[PDB]
Design a protein around this ligand. Structure first.
Ligand SMILES: C[C@@H](O)[C@H](NC(=O)c1ccc(C#CC#Cc2ccccc2)cc1)C(=O)NO
Ligand SMILES: [Zn+2]
Length: 300
């Protein structure tokens, strides 16, 4: 029982709007051969431009994670990449009719459900993991992102907002994926923004697809969303979701621990680039016997 690479069993399609562009977009997830990785494809262009979901192709990291190849872009890939990492998808072609991945409901729930509705296929090649051997850290002002050696996969995150809805123990969370489910405890965490920031982004022709149906909107004192939150600590869980997605730009699942302190898409990519460059801090490992592996996946 070796831990095998996985792809999709069937093609699956979805429609949505880009959070920032507001453009209607058709998404197609397709099976892919062994060692392809996650590859984004702009099918609206002629010729079709393919962009591997790797750290080396990350462009602008202000609002969302963008993949670039030349002057062709694919915006906001993190929630989809978070779903693929959470379900152990090694190989897949992601086709898009526009430059931005659809926001859906702001979380990874709809992608996780679409991927599992199509089903997974174990392939005939061993799953490759990146094991953290030494600590790697990056800092920028009071922000920090760290990789720590750990026999499993764990993500810790802390946010720091001086605001009435962001107090208590809900500003920090730790998820150990050996005991906790990505689907149940992290996948449904929606993206969020403060109204003054959203107003600024809309004035710069950004956040155009944003709404209460795909984002948690917080004003100076409350959550404006009528139906409320899905988790008591939904905001820090969304940051954990973002980190899993950004970390998947390594190209393989991690055996280690991530700790983020006010970290974002920019600092997360800087942590990846430093890890990749410090080759003594990591190694590639496979598991011919799943009983000796510290990470476990759900049946395909
Ligand atoms: C890091 C994380 O925050 C970040 N999210 C955002 O940057 C973000 C930006 C804009 C909006 C929005 C919106 C809206 C709206 C609206 C609602 C009612 C009336 C008018 C507009 C939501 C999230 C994120 O999830 N990146 O992965
Ligand atoms: Zn996000």
């Amino acid at each position: 029982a070796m831990i095998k690479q996985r792809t999709l069993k069937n093609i699956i399609r979805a429609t949505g709007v880009g959070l920032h562009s507001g453009e209607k977009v058709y998404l197609t997830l397709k099976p892919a051969p062994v060692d392809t990785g996650i590859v984004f494809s702009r099918t609206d262009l002629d010729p079709v431009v393919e962009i591997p979901a790797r750290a080396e192709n990350v462009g602008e990291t202000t609002m969302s994670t963008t993949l670039v190849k030349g002057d062709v872009k694919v915006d906001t890939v993190e929630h989809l990449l978070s779903a693929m990492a959470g379900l152990g998808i090694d190989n897949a072609y992601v086709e898009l009719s526009a430059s931005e991945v659809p926001i859906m409901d702001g979380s990874a729930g709809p992608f996780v459900f679409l991927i599992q509705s199509a089903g997974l296929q174990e392939q005939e090649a061993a799953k490759k993991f990146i094991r953290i051997k030494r600590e790697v850290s990056v800092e920028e002002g009071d922000k920090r992102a760290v990789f720590v050696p750990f026999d499993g996969f764990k993500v810790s995150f802390e946010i720091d907002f001086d605001h009435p809805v962001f107090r208590g123990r809900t500003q920090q969370a730790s998820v150990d994926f050996s005991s906790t489910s990505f689907v149940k405890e992290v996948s449904r965490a929606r993206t969020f923004g403060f109204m003054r920031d959203i107003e600024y982004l809309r004035s710069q022709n950004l956040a155009l697809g944003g709404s209460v149906e795909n984002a948690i909107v917080v004003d100076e004192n409350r959550v404006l969303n009528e139906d409320g939150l899905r988790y008591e600590d939904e905001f820090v869980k969304h940051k954990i979701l973002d980190a899993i997605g950004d970390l998947y730009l390594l190209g393989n699942s991690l055996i280690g621990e991530f700790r983020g302190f006010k970290s974002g898409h920019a600092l997360n990519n800087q942590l990846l680039r430093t890890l990749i460059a410090d080759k003594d801090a990591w190694e590639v490992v496979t598991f011919e016997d799943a009983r000796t592996a510290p990470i476990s996946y759900m049946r395909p």
